[PDB]
Write a protein that binds this ligand. Structure first.
Ligand code: K
Ligand code: K
Ligand code: K
Lengths: 283, 272
């Protein structure tokens, strides 16, 4: 019954048409977005076709009072193919033409913006260790997990936040979910390129100090990781988030080493080991 | 390593104008330039195929067909002069589009933080000290990263020189940063000997004609772009002793939920 999913998205039921037009257009699935555009596209042409027919027989070589011909003319005119069979006739016909033209290009301008707006989004090639572990590092128990860069390109001034979210009781007895940012031994990595094992030493200042497993479940506590940095691939900022529940903490565990030796003998990175955690089993 | 796995502020004005007007401006410019070009054509004189001699309409409409590059084919350039004007217009047309597009995109690509502000603030005991607070709710499924908020008191004061003006006090929040704002955030300004509103009653707040300004900003994942939102409270929108109700619920299913209805609800003790 977790508050936060693995993907980092909160896991809650929200309780609440043209209101949020811009957001919606960027939020919709490509299929739908294209459909919407198409719909609008056809629609307006039909509208214009009617405008033409309304004037009546104002298009060269058009079957009298036929919507098809008018519609197709309308597209040839708005897309500015303008083949040349169907042609405007008289002031009314033509004014509608120069109006449509403008409309066509404006549509393109709007379409383009939308396309570019939804198209130009990078994604940090970052993978999160499926688990966290708590183990002795440098003489103090330390909470940790690790990121692996999935691309050849590097991420500059990358940095990461490890935030504990758990329930608390105030002196006044208010019961709330609070956020604790956990001091990391290393929060900045000016050049993140392969793997980074993040660590939160646990001492008298750690909000999880002298805390067992039982105690973590009891505060219904989770752990949220936010990574961000500047990806050279895209020459633009990227970010990635991930969340762990109390039960994804492997106590006593140690992340295996991803750095391996081949028959060639050169050091290599194996992403397979990335999720592997060493563990002592004591019967 | 081997991986195994009037014309002064033109730009501002163009972005600031209402869509109706902006489209009009564009349209105006559009028609205008075509008329200009039409004249250029007529100026040469009868240089367009199938054009009624010395008729502006024909020239104008030709000009549009040429600049929008429909180029139907009835009206056609004739001779060097006609055509040069053509290849000139063409260029002009596309450039216009490039400019129009930029403008369109520039004014079109403006996200809005899906953020809702609690209609009221409250002053109540939290963690053993009276605390001023209000709360934000994210109205979208998408998350806002490194979100942060400013709580600024604005009130009247006296200078040593005795100027009675309006000053800004940023109020220390127990939590000013939220790297991941996703549902609801209750912002708090503990009131102690350092709070500009320390040992202040309601009467005293009205007296300084004091208000409270909230600025929220953060990076919205929806738009992959920065967003912001501002809100303001007057002295009388402070509910003394009040406590924001809880928006969280456990469903019958045992699954957590958020009710935005409760969001504006403030608990209160009435003592006859
Ligand atoms: K064309
Ligand atoms: K064409
Ligand atoms: K043609």
């Amino acid at each position: 019954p977790r508050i936060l999913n693995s993907d980092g998205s909160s896991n809650i039921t929200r309780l609440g048409w043209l209101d949020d037009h811009y957001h919606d257009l960027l939020t919709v699935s490509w299929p739908v977005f294209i459909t919407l555009i198409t719909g609008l596209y056809l629609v307006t042409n039909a509208l214009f076709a009617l405008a033409y027919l309304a004037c009546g027989d104002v298009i060269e070589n058009a079957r009298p009072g036929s919507f098809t011909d008018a519609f197709f003319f309308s597209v040839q005119t708005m897309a500015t193919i303008g083949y040349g069979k169907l042609i405007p006739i008289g002031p009314l016909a033509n004014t509608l033409v120069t109006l449509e033209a403008l409309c066509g290009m404006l549509g393109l301008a709007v379409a383009a913006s939308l396309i570019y707006a939804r198209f130009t989004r990078p994604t940090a090639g970052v993978l999160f260790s499926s688990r966290m572990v708590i183990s002795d590092f440098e003489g103090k128990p330390t909470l940790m997990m690790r990121l692996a860069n999935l691309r050849i390109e590097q991420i500059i001034e990358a940095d990461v936040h490890l935030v504990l979210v758990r329930s608390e009781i105030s002196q006044e007895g208010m019961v709330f979910r609070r956020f604790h940012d956990l001091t990391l031994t290393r929060s900045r990595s000016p050049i993140f390129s392969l793997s980074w094992t993040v660590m939160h030493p646990i001492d008298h200042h750690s909000p999880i100090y002298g805390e067992t497993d039982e105690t973590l479940r009891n505060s219904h506590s989770e752990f949220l990781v936010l990574f961000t940095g500047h990806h050279e691939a895209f020459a633009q900022n990227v970010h990635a988030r991930h969340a762990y529940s109390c039960d994804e903490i492997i106590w006593g565990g140690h992340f295996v080493d991803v750095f391996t030796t081949l028959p060639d003998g050169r050091r290599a990175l194996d992403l397979g080991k990335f999720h592997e955690i060493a563990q002592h089993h004591h019967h």
